[PDB]
Amino acid sequence: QVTLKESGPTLVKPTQTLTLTCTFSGFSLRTSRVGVSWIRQPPGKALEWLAHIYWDDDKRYNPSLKSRLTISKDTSKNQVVLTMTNMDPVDTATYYCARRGFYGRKYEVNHFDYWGQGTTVTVSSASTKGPSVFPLAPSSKSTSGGTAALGCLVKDYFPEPVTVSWNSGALTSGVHTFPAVLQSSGLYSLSSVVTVPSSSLGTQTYICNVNHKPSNTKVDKKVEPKSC
Amino acid sequence: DIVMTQSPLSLPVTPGEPASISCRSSQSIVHSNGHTYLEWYLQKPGQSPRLLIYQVSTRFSGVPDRFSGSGSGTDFTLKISRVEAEDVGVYYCFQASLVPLTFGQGTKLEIKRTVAAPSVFIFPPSDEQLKSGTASVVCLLNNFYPREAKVQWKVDNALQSGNSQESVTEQDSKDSTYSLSSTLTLSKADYEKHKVYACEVTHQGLSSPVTKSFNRGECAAADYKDDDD
């Protein structure tokens, strides 16, 4: 399988320079005719194309950001790099790399095929901060007609994103991780919630896994009902 | 330059029904080589967009028969013949013939589905958080449709404003529902001045409002357990 993966800084102070990387697997840039683009999506906004690099090292750039963009290649490490200078709060976004592949023996067909998972970039003067994680304990007040809710409250972290699985190894059916909201304090908060059978609530362990890559923190919180 | 418009931006559709999206470009997107590089994507919430159609009308592999594209020149159409639950998300058309390559503004498809009341749950602050000097009370409206909902907070029977905040998930791709959290935000001290914390949910699926509440520092009655030695 071919795969692309973005990495780079998650936080860049305004006016500073962003370097993002797209590593490829399953084929070798160095030997292929494919193009590679960078595309970004600010939260709640449309996709915007940024830059493209062809196999031969020709390059195109979005006219309105050209002066601040550089796309380049490192074929010994199988990467494609984006440098973006003078970062601005309006540049906070998910950045994706996408491949434009060729199909047919003679090279008859091209179109973008694979995109990376994306990487979240935030432009801000604020420091990085790890989350505190708190149980949302199941009770009769969090139950209705054979169904019970419990959760984790993931709070006081910066910047985005946090990932939350359930059970040290994702289990699902009724898992809801709410989009984060930026608090009054300027830190993010969110809840992740799961609904389960209410009459097997005390048979089962529910231990929520929180990872915040920017700060290096990983937390596992045992969520137990009761107090008294 | 080269502008891409989509119509409409919000598309409500009853499952099993046809659906149709427009994508017009302000000048021809026919590449000099003769080909028209028109691509359509489906983006699921917080996730990487996935290619449906390329070259105007060619369905990418793994993409179900119900998806098809058409038009030419400046006029384009994505057609879904039989809308499923799995098709919810945001659709984008993308011209990749001309620099700068451009995407349309995106069309959110919504499943028109069928009415469902929210389940209402409430969660007091944990002792852990109280420890650090903040209190967060979470109310939870699970698995409802449609989106519109009114969640009101009452602390010792007074209506709160300005200290709560909502967060909504996207339409579930399997059941077509939403879920929403409302979080009450207070200092530990303000939290301790009061006893009854109440979350009040109104929704066109419930016949009258449902309230859920608890009393600070007390275990609820339904949660009776015998004492130990």
mmCIF file of all heavy atoms in Angstrom, chain B residues 18-65:
data_model
loop_
_atom_site.group_PDB
_atom_site.id
_atom_site.type_symbol
_atom_site.label_atom_id
_atom_site.label_comp_id
_atom_site.label_asym_id
_atom_site.label_seq_id
_atom_site.Cartn_x
_atom_site.Cartn_y
_atom_site.Cartn_z
ATOM 1 N N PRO B 18 -32.900 10.411 -4.293
ATOM 2 C CA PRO B 18 -31.799 10.994 -5.085
ATOM 3 C C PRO B 18 -31.195 12.245 -4.438
ATOM 4 O O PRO B 18 -31.842 12.864 -3.599
ATOM 5 C CB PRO B 18 -32.473 11.353 -6.424
ATOM 6 C CG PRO B 18 -33.934 11.272 -6.169
ATOM 7 C CD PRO B 18 -34.121 10.259 -5.105
ATOM 8 N N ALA B 19 -29.953 12.573 -4.812
ATOM 9 C CA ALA B 19 -29.256 13.807 -4.403
ATOM 10 C C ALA B 19 -28.356 14.360 -5.514
ATOM 11 O O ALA B 19 -27.838 13.615 -6.350
ATOM 12 C CB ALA B 19 -28.439 13.601 -3.115
ATOM 13 N N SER B 20 -28.155 15.674 -5.497
ATOM 14 C CA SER B 20 -27.490 16.351 -6.595
ATOM 15 C C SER B 20 -26.771 17.626 -6.151
ATOM 16 O O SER B 20 -27.331 18.455 -5.431
ATOM 17 C CB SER B 20 -28.502 16.665 -7.686
ATOM 18 O OG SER B 20 -27.850 16.798 -8.922
ATOM 19 N N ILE B 21 -25.516 17.761 -6.575
ATOM 20 C CA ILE B 21 -24.694 18.918 -6.216
ATOM 21 C C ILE B 21 -24.180 19.595 -7.475
ATOM 22 O O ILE B 21 -23.833 18.939 -8.457
ATOM 23 C CB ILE B 21 -23.538 18.535 -5.261
ATOM 24 C CG1 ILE B 21 -24.102 17.996 -3.941
ATOM 25 C CG2 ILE B 21 -22.644 19.739 -4.970
ATOM 26 C CD1 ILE B 21 -23.076 17.321 -3.011
ATOM 27 N N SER B 22 -24.181 20.917 -7.469
ATOM 28 C CA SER B 22 -23.642 21.629 -8.602
ATOM 29 C C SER B 22 -22.235 22.159 -8.325
ATOM 30 O O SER B 22 -21.918 22.584 -7.202
ATOM 31 C CB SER B 22 -24.574 22.749 -9.042
ATOM 32 O OG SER B 22 -24.099 23.277 -10.257
ATOM 33 N N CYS B 23 -21.388 22.115 -9.352
ATOM 34 C CA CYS B 23 -20.083 22.739 -9.284
ATOM 35 C C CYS B 23 -19.735 23.458 -10.589
ATOM 36 O O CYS B 23 -19.359 22.830 -11.585
ATOM 37 C CB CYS B 23 -19.022 21.702 -8.926
ATOM 38 S SG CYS B 23 -17.400 22.330 -9.025
ATOM 39 N N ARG B 24 -19.859 24.783 -10.558
ATOM 40 C CA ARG B 24 -19.552 25.648 -11.695
ATOM 41 C C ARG B 24 -18.194 26.351 -11.515
ATOM 42 O O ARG B 24 -17.826 26.760 -10.407
ATOM 43 C CB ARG B 24 -20.689 26.657 -11.907
ATOM 44 C CG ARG B 24 -21.855 26.110 -12.727
ATOM 45 C CD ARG B 24 -22.933 27.173 -12.974
ATOM 46 N NE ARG B 24 -23.615 26.988 -14.263
ATOM 47 C CZ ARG B 24 -24.218 27.963 -14.958
ATOM 48 N NH1 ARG B 24 -24.241 29.210 -14.497
ATOM 49 N NH2 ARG B 24 -24.809 27.702 -16.128
ATOM 50 N N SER B 25 -17.441 26.445 -12.603
ATOM 51 C CA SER B 25 -16.178 27.169 -12.652
ATOM 52 C C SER B 25 -16.404 28.402 -13.489
ATOM 53 O O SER B 25 -17.270 28.410 -14.353
ATOM 54 C CB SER B 25 -15.067 26.311 -13.263
ATOM 55 O OG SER B 25 -15.373 25.882 -14.580
ATOM 56 N N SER B 26 -15.640 29.454 -13.230
ATOM 57 C CA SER B 26 -15.914 30.765 -13.844
ATOM 58 C C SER B 26 -15.316 30.880 -15.251
ATOM 59 O O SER B 26 -15.567 31.849 -15.956
ATOM 60 C CB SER B 26 -15.377 31.875 -12.955
ATOM 61 O OG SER B 26 -13.993 31.694 -12.704
ATOM 62 N N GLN B 27 -14.503 29.890 -15.631
ATOM 63 C CA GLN B 27 -13.988 29.770 -16.996
ATOM 64 C C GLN B 27 -13.732 28.291 -17.225
ATOM 65 O O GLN B 27 -13.714 27.514 -16.268
ATOM 66 C CB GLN B 27 -12.696 30.591 -17.199
ATOM 67 C CG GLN B 27 -11.467 30.125 -16.331
ATOM 68 C CD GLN B 27 -10.152 30.889 -16.637
ATOM 69 O OE1 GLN B 27 -9.065 30.289 -16.689
ATOM 70 N NE2 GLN B 27 -10.255 32.204 -16.835
ATOM 71 N N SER B 28 -13.536 27.898 -18.473
ATOM 72 C CA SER B 28 -13.357 26.503 -18.786
ATOM 73 C C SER B 28 -12.208 25.896 -17.990
ATOM 74 O O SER B 28 -11.149 26.499 -17.882
ATOM 75 C CB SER B 28 -13.082 26.308 -20.281
ATOM 76 O OG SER B 28 -12.478 25.036 -20.442
ATOM 77 N N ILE B 29 -12.422 24.721 -17.417
ATOM 78 C CA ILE B 29 -11.329 24.016 -16.766
ATOM 79 C C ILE B 29 -10.798 22.853 -17.630
ATOM 80 O O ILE B 29 -10.255 21.888 -17.123
ATOM 81 C CB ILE B 29 -11.688 23.542 -15.330
ATOM 82 C CG1 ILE B 29 -12.991 22.744 -15.326
ATOM 83 C CG2 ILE B 29 -11.766 24.748 -14.360
ATOM 84 C CD1 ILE B 29 -13.175 21.988 -14.071
ATOM 85 N N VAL B 30 -10.968 22.967 -18.948
ATOM 86 C CA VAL B 30 -10.389 22.008 -19.873
ATOM 87 C C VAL B 30 -8.921 22.330 -19.967
ATOM 88 O O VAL B 30 -8.565 23.444 -20.330
ATOM 89 C CB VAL B 30 -11.014 22.088 -21.282
ATOM 90 C CG1 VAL B 30 -10.331 21.092 -22.223
ATOM 91 C CG2 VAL B 30 -12.514 21.806 -21.207
ATOM 92 N N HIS B 31 -8.079 21.353 -19.632
ATOM 93 C CA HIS B 31 -6.634 21.502 -19.778
ATOM 94 C C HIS B 31 -6.262 21.578 -21.258
ATOM 95 O O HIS B 31 -6.939 20.993 -22.119
ATOM 96 C CB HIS B 31 -5.911 20.344 -19.088
ATOM 97 C CG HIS B 31 -4.418 20.472 -19.078
ATOM 98 N ND1 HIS B 31 -3.730 21.073 -18.044
ATOM 99 C CD2 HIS B 31 -3.482 20.088 -19.975
ATOM 100 C CE1 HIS B 31 -2.436 21.041 -18.301
ATOM 101 N NE2 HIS B 31 -2.259 20.454 -19.469
ATOM 102 N N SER B 32 -5.186 22.305 -21.547
ATOM 103 C CA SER B 32 -4.659 22.374 -22.891
ATOM 104 C C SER B 32 -4.519 20.999 -23.509
ATOM 105 O O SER B 32 -4.879 20.855 -24.657
ATOM 106 C CB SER B 32 -3.339 23.143 -22.953
ATOM 107 O OG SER B 32 -2.300 22.436 -22.320
ATOM 108 N N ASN B 33 -4.076 19.987 -22.757
ATOM 109 C CA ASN B 33 -4.009 18.607 -23.327
ATOM 110 C C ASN B 33 -5.338 17.939 -23.747
ATOM 111 O O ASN B 33 -5.338 16.805 -24.252
ATOM 112 C CB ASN B 33 -3.247 17.639 -22.417
ATOM 113 C CG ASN B 33 -3.956 17.389 -21.090
ATOM 114 O OD1 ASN B 33 -5.142 17.706 -20.918
ATOM 115 N ND2 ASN B 33 -3.205 16.849 -20.116
ATOM 116 N N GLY B 34 -6.458 18.623 -23.515
ATOM 117 C CA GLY B 34 -7.780 18.109 -23.911
ATOM 118 C C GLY B 34 -8.565 17.538 -22.736
ATOM 119 O O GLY B 34 -9.781 17.387 -22.808
ATOM 120 N N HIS B 35 -7.885 17.208 -21.649
ATOM 121 C CA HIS B 35 -8.578 16.587 -20.534
ATOM 122 C C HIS B 35 -9.116 17.618 -19.582
ATOM 123 O O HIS B 35 -8.571 18.745 -19.491
ATOM 124 C CB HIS B 35 -7.681 15.588 -19.827
ATOM 125 C CG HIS B 35 -7.184 14.512 -20.739
ATOM 126 N ND1 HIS B 35 -5.845 14.288 -20.964
ATOM 127 C CD2 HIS B 35 -7.853 13.627 -21.518
ATOM 128 C CE1 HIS B 35 -5.709 13.288 -21.824
ATOM 129 N NE2 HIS B 35 -6.913 12.873 -22.178
ATOM 130 N N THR B 36 -10.214 17.252 -18.919
ATOM 131 C CA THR B 36 -10.815 18.107 -17.898
ATOM 132 C C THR B 36 -10.549 17.479 -16.547
ATOM 133 O O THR B 36 -11.063 16.401 -16.278
ATOM 134 C CB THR B 36 -12.328 18.290 -18.121
ATOM 135 O OG1 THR B 36 -12.595 18.470 -19.523
ATOM 136 C CG2 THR B 36 -12.861 19.481 -17.314
ATOM 137 N N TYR B 37 -9.745 18.151 -15.709
ATOM 138 C CA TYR B 37 -9.285 17.586 -14.417
ATOM 139 C C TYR B 37 -10.201 18.008 -13.307
ATOM 140 O O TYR B 37 -9.843 18.880 -12.480
ATOM 141 C CB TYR B 37 -7.801 17.905 -14.110
ATOM 142 C CG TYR B 37 -6.858 17.197 -15.057
ATOM 143 C CD1 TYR B 37 -6.387 17.844 -16.206
ATOM 144 C CD2 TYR B 37 -6.525 15.838 -14.870
ATOM 145 C CE1 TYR B 37 -5.562 17.206 -17.102
ATOM 146 C CE2 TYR B 37 -5.692 15.149 -15.782
ATOM 147 C CZ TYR B 37 -5.227 15.851 -16.899
ATOM 148 O OH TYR B 37 -4.420 15.253 -17.809
ATOM 149 N N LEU B 38 -11.418 17.438 -13.316
ATOM 150 C CA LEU B 38 -12.401 17.726 -12.278
ATOM 151 C C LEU B 38 -12.534 16.540 -11.346
ATOM 152 O O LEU B 38 -12.890 15.440 -11.804
ATOM 153 C CB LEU B 38 -13.751 18.131 -12.857
ATOM 154 C CG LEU B 38 -14.608 18.538 -11.659
ATOM 155 C CD1 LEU B 38 -14.145 19.860 -11.024
ATOM 156 C CD2 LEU B 38 -16.059 18.589 -12.038
ATOM 157 N N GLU B 39 -12.210 16.765 -10.075
ATOM 158 C CA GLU B 39 -12.270 15.767 -8.985
ATOM 159 C C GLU B 39 -13.344 16.142 -7.922
ATOM 160 O O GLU B 39 -13.605 17.324 -7.683
ATOM 161 C CB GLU B 39 -10.937 15.673 -8.245
ATOM 162 C CG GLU B 39 -9.721 15.465 -9.117
ATOM 163 C CD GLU B 39 -8.442 15.047 -8.344
ATOM 164 O OE1 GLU B 39 -8.368 15.115 -7.078
ATOM 165 O OE2 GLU B 39 -7.473 14.679 -9.023
ATOM 166 N N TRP B 40 -13.972 15.122 -7.319
ATOM 167 C CA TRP B 40 -14.967 15.290 -6.239
ATOM 168 C C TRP B 40 -14.509 14.499 -5.021
ATOM 169 O O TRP B 40 -14.054 13.342 -5.110
ATOM 170 C CB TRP B 40 -16.375 14.808 -6.636
ATOM 171 C CG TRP B 40 -17.146 15.634 -7.651
ATOM 172 C CD1 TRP B 40 -17.177 15.451 -9.011
ATOM 173 C CD2 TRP B 40 -18.080 16.700 -7.381
ATOM 174 N NE1 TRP B 40 -18.053 16.358 -9.608
ATOM 175 C CE2 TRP B 40 -18.617 17.129 -8.628
ATOM 176 C CE3 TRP B 40 -18.517 17.332 -6.210
ATOM 177 C CZ2 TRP B 40 -19.526 18.190 -8.730
ATOM 178 C CZ3 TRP B 40 -19.426 18.367 -6.316
ATOM 179 C CH2 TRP B 40 -19.922 18.791 -7.565
ATOM 180 N N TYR B 41 -14.632 15.132 -3.871
ATOM 181 C CA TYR B 41 -14.235 14.494 -2.626
ATOM 182 C C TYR B 41 -15.369 14.444 -1.622
ATOM 183 O O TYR B 41 -16.335 15.207 -1.709
ATOM 184 C CB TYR B 41 -13.106 15.262 -2.014
ATOM 185 C CG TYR B 41 -11.806 15.080 -2.711
ATOM 186 C CD1 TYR B 41 -11.433 15.913 -3.768
ATOM 187 C CD2 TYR B 41 -10.908 14.102 -2.285
ATOM 188 C CE1 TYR B 41 -10.229 15.741 -4.402
ATOM 189 C CE2 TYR B 41 -9.690 13.927 -2.906
ATOM 190 C CZ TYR B 41 -9.355 14.749 -3.950
ATOM 191 O OH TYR B 41 -8.143 14.574 -4.539
ATOM 192 N N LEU B 42 -15.251 13.507 -0.697
ATOM 193 C CA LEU B 42 -16.118 13.452 0.455
ATOM 194 C C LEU B 42 -15.242 13.547 1.684
ATOM 195 O O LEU B 42 -14.291 12.771 1.881
ATOM 196 C CB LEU B 42 -16.946 12.167 0.465
ATOM 197 C CG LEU B 42 -17.813 11.879 1.686
ATOM 198 C CD1 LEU B 42 -18.765 13.049 1.984
ATOM 199 C CD2 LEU B 42 -18.566 10.558 1.502
ATOM 200 N N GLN B 43 -15.542 14.539 2.495
ATOM 201 C CA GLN B 43 -14.800 14.696 3.713
ATOM 202 C C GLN B 43 -15.699 14.401 4.871
ATOM 203 O O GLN B 43 -16.746 15.033 5.051
ATOM 204 C CB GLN B 43 -14.127 16.077 3.848
ATOM 205 C CG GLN B 43 -13.075 16.073 4.988
ATOM 206 C CD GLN B 43 -12.352 17.403 5.209
ATOM 207 O OE1 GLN B 43 -12.877 18.476 4.932
ATOM 208 N NE2 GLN B 43 -11.145 17.328 5.747
ATOM 209 N N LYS B 44 -15.283 13.392 5.622
ATOM 210 C CA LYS B 44 -15.833 13.117 6.926
ATOM 211 C C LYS B 44 -15.106 13.965 7.958
ATOM 212 O O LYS B 44 -13.881 14.074 7.929
ATOM 213 C CB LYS B 44 -15.696 11.637 7.260
ATOM 214 C CG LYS B 44 -16.467 10.715 6.319
ATOM 215 C CD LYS B 44 -17.875 10.491 6.864
ATOM 216 C CE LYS B 44 -18.632 9.438 6.077
ATOM 217 N NZ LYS B 44 -20.080 9.510 6.402
ATOM 218 N N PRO B 45 -15.877 14.614 8.838
ATOM 219 C CA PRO B 45 -15.524 15.320 10.079
ATOM 220 C C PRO B 45 -14.178 14.925 10.723
ATOM 221 O O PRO B 45 -13.991 13.747 11.111
ATOM 222 C CB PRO B 45 -16.688 14.920 11.012
ATOM 223 C CG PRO B 45 -17.839 14.346 10.006
ATOM 224 C CD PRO B 45 -17.332 14.662 8.628
ATOM 225 N N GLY B 46 -13.276 15.918 10.841
ATOM 226 C CA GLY B 46 -11.945 15.773 11.473
ATOM 227 C C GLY B 46 -11.022 14.774 10.771
ATOM 228 O O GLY B 46 -10.102 14.194 11.385
ATOM 229 N N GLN B 47 -11.272 14.561 9.481
ATOM 230 C CA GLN B 47 -10.671 13.448 8.760
ATOM 231 C C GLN B 47 -10.289 13.834 7.325
ATOM 232 O O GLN B 47 -10.763 14.825 6.766
ATOM 233 C CB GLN B 47 -11.591 12.212 8.866
ATOM 234 C CG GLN B 47 -11.776 11.365 7.599
ATOM 235 C CD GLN B 47 -12.302 9.938 7.917
ATOM 236 O OE1 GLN B 47 -12.161 9.448 9.058
ATOM 237 N NE2 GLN B 47 -12.895 9.267 6.903
ATOM 238 N N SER B 48 -9.406 13.046 6.739
ATOM 239 C CA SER B 48 -8.832 13.357 5.454
ATOM 240 C C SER B 48 -9.838 13.140 4.301
ATOM 241 O O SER B 48 -10.580 12.164 4.291
ATOM 242 C CB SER B 48 -7.564 12.540 5.290
ATOM 243 O OG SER B 48 -7.161 12.579 3.945
ATOM 244 N N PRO B 49 -9.900 14.077 3.344
ATOM 245 C CA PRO B 49 -10.961 13.951 2.344
ATOM 246 C C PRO B 49 -10.681 12.789 1.401
ATOM 247 O O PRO B 49 -9.550 12.504 1.140
ATOM 248 C CB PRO B 49 -10.922 15.300 1.610
ATOM 249 C CG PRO B 49 -9.627 15.884 1.917
ATOM 250 C CD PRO B 49 -9.219 15.385 3.268
ATOM 251 N N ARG B 50 -11.702 12.086 0.938
ATOM 252 C CA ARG B 50 -11.469 10.874 0.172
ATOM 253 C C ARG B 50 -12.070 11.030 -1.226
ATOM 254 O O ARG B 50 -13.212 11.493 -1.386
ATOM 255 C CB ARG B 50 -12.014 9.667 0.908
ATOM 256 C CG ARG B 50 -11.270 8.371 0.590
ATOM 257 C CD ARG B 50 -11.861 7.142 1.377
ATOM 258 N NE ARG B 50 -12.872 6.323 0.658
ATOM 259 C CZ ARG B 50 -14.154 6.656 0.457
ATOM 260 N NH1 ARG B 50 -14.619 7.824 0.886
ATOM 261 N NH2 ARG B 50 -14.978 5.821 -0.172
ATOM 262 N N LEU B 51 -11.266 10.698 -2.235
ATOM 263 C CA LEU B 51 -11.653 10.888 -3.636
ATOM 264 C C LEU B 51 -12.815 9.955 -4.081
ATOM 265 O O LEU B 51 -12.775 8.733 -3.918
ATOM 266 C CB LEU B 51 -10.425 10.685 -4.559
ATOM 267 C CG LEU B 51 -10.683 10.639 -6.075
ATOM 268 C CD1 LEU B 51 -10.952 12.020 -6.676
ATOM 269 C CD2 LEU B 51 -9.539 9.985 -6.806
ATOM 270 N N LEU B 52 -13.825 10.548 -4.677
ATOM 271 C CA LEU B 52 -14.967 9.817 -5.211
ATOM 272 C C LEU B 52 -14.890 9.646 -6.705
ATOM 273 O O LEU B 52 -14.991 8.535 -7.228
ATOM 274 C CB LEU B 52 -16.268 10.552 -4.880
ATOM 275 C CG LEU B 52 -16.565 10.799 -3.397
ATOM 276 C CD1 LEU B 52 -17.781 11.712 -3.266
ATOM 277 C CD2 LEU B 52 -16.786 9.445 -2.653
ATOM 278 N N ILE B 53 -14.740 10.775 -7.389
ATOM 279 C CA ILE B 53 -14.784 10.878 -8.852
ATOM 280 C C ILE B 53 -13.590 11.706 -9.317
ATOM 281 O O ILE B 53 -13.223 12.717 -8.675
ATOM 282 C CB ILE B 53 -16.101 11.602 -9.291
ATOM 283 C CG1 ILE B 53 -17.336 10.846 -8.792
ATOM 284 C CG2 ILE B 53 -16.122 11.889 -10.782
ATOM 285 C CD1 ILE B 53 -17.456 9.400 -9.309
ATOM 286 N N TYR B 54 -12.992 11.315 -10.441
ATOM 287 C CA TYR B 54 -11.993 12.169 -11.086
ATOM 288 C C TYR B 54 -12.298 12.227 -12.588
ATOM 289 O O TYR B 54 -13.123 11.462 -13.081
ATOM 290 C CB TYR B 54 -10.562 11.678 -10.778
ATOM 291 C CG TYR B 54 -10.261 10.322 -11.357
ATOM 292 C CD1 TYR B 54 -9.842 10.188 -12.679
ATOM 293 C CD2 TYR B 54 -10.405 9.164 -10.586
ATOM 294 C CE1 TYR B 54 -9.569 8.926 -13.236
ATOM 295 C CE2 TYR B 54 -10.146 7.920 -11.111
ATOM 296 C CZ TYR B 54 -9.732 7.799 -12.448
ATOM 297 O OH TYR B 54 -9.477 6.551 -12.994
ATOM 298 N N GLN B 55 -11.641 13.134 -13.310
ATOM 299 C CA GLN B 55 -11.899 13.374 -14.744
ATOM 300 C C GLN B 55 -13.393 13.560 -15.042
ATOM 301 O O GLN B 55 -13.936 13.011 -16.022
ATOM 302 C CB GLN B 55 -11.259 12.299 -15.646
ATOM 303 C CG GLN B 55 -9.708 12.353 -15.733
ATOM 304 C CD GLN B 55 -9.145 12.746 -17.115
ATOM 305 O OE1 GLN B 55 -8.572 13.827 -17.256
ATOM 306 N NE2 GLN B 55 -9.284 11.871 -18.114
ATOM 307 N N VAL B 56 -14.054 14.346 -14.195
ATOM 308 C CA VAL B 56 -15.457 14.662 -14.400
ATOM 309 C C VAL B 56 -16.355 13.483 -14.031
ATOM 310 O O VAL B 56 -17.244 13.612 -13.210
ATOM 311 C CB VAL B 56 -15.745 15.151 -15.891
ATOM 312 C CG1 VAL B 56 -17.224 15.423 -16.121
ATOM 313 C CG2 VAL B 56 -14.919 16.365 -16.209
ATOM 314 N N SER B 57 -16.110 12.319 -14.613
ATOM 315 C CA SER B 57 -17.099 11.272 -14.517
ATOM 316 C C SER B 57 -16.570 9.884 -14.163
ATOM 317 O O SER B 57 -17.330 8.904 -14.207
ATOM 318 C CB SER B 57 -17.908 11.243 -15.808
ATOM 319 O OG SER B 57 -17.072 10.899 -16.895
ATOM 320 N N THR B 58 -15.288 9.770 -13.824
ATOM 321 C CA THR B 58 -14.748 8.424 -13.512
ATOM 322 C C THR B 58 -14.731 8.162 -12.009
ATOM 323 O O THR B 58 -14.148 8.924 -11.229
ATOM 324 C CB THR B 58 -13.351 8.166 -14.096
ATOM 325 O OG1 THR B 58 -13.362 8.448 -15.503
ATOM 326 C CG2 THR B 58 -12.928 6.678 -13.858
ATOM 327 N N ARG B 59 -15.389 7.088 -11.615
ATOM 328 C CA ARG B 59 -15.497 6.719 -10.229
ATOM 329 C C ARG B 59 -14.182 6.064 -9.788
ATOM 330 O O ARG B 59 -13.734 5.103 -10.404
ATOM 331 C CB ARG B 59 -16.676 5.770 -10.089
ATOM 332 C CG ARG B 59 -17.100 5.508 -8.675
ATOM 333 C CD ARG B 59 -18.181 4.434 -8.553
ATOM 334 N NE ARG B 59 -19.385 4.813 -9.277
ATOM 335 C CZ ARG B 59 -19.789 4.250 -10.410
ATOM 336 N NH1 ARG B 59 -19.098 3.252 -10.949
ATOM 337 N NH2 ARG B 59 -20.900 4.678 -10.993
ATOM 338 N N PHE B 60 -13.541 6.624 -8.753
ATOM 339 C CA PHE B 60 -12.319 6.033 -8.197
ATOM 340 C C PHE B 60 -12.665 4.664 -7.594
ATOM 341 O O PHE B 60 -13.801 4.440 -7.187
ATOM 342 C CB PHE B 60 -11.688 7.003 -7.176
ATOM 343 C CG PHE B 60 -10.349 6.547 -6.593
ATOM 344 C CD1 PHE B 60 -9.283 6.164 -7.424
ATOM 345 C CD2 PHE B 60 -10.150 6.534 -5.200
ATOM 346 C CE1 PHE B 60 -8.045 5.727 -6.866
ATOM 347 C CE2 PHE B 60 -8.924 6.135 -4.643
ATOM 348 C CZ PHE B 60 -7.872 5.712 -5.473
ATOM 349 N N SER B 61 -11.707 3.743 -7.581
ATOM 350 C CA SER B 61 -11.917 2.382 -7.032
ATOM 351 C C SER B 61 -12.334 2.383 -5.563
ATOM 352 O O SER B 61 -11.855 3.221 -4.757
ATOM 353 C CB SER B 61 -10.650 1.536 -7.166
ATOM 354 O OG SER B 61 -9.515 2.277 -6.698
ATOM 355 N N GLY B 62 -13.202 1.427 -5.229
ATOM 356 C CA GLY B 62 -13.800 1.310 -3.894
ATOM 357 C C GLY B 62 -15.029 2.191 -3.662
ATOM 358 O O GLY B 62 -15.690 2.094 -2.621
ATOM 359 N N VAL B 63 -15.322 3.061 -4.625
ATOM 360 C CA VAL B 63 -16.436 3.995 -4.532
ATOM 361 C C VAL B 63 -17.694 3.321 -5.105
ATOM 362 O O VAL B 63 -17.669 2.773 -6.212
ATOM 363 C CB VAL B 63 -16.120 5.330 -5.243
ATOM 364 C CG1 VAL B 63 -17.347 6.240 -5.277
ATOM 365 C CG2 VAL B 63 -14.953 6.044 -4.562
ATOM 366 N N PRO B 64 -18.783 3.336 -4.329
ATOM 367 C CA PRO B 64 -20.023 2.631 -4.672
ATOM 368 C C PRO B 64 -20.698 3.196 -5.919
ATOM 369 O O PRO B 64 -20.617 4.411 -6.157
ATOM 370 C CB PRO B 64 -20.918 2.878 -3.448
ATOM 371 C CG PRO B 64 -19.986 3.351 -2.326
ATOM 372 C CD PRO B 64 -18.831 3.999 -3.001
ATOM 373 N N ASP B 65 -21.354 2.319 -6.684
ATOM 374 C CA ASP B 65 -22.117 2.659 -7.906
ATOM 375 C C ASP B 65 -23.027 3.863 -7.816
ATOM 376 O O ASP B 65 -23.295 4.509 -8.837
ATOM 377 C CB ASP B 65 -23.028 1.500 -8.336
ATOM 378 C CG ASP B 65 -22.268 0.344 -8.899
ATOM 379 O OD1 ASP B 65 -21.034 0.329 -8.697
ATOM 380 O OD2 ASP B 65 -22.891 -0.541 -9.542
#
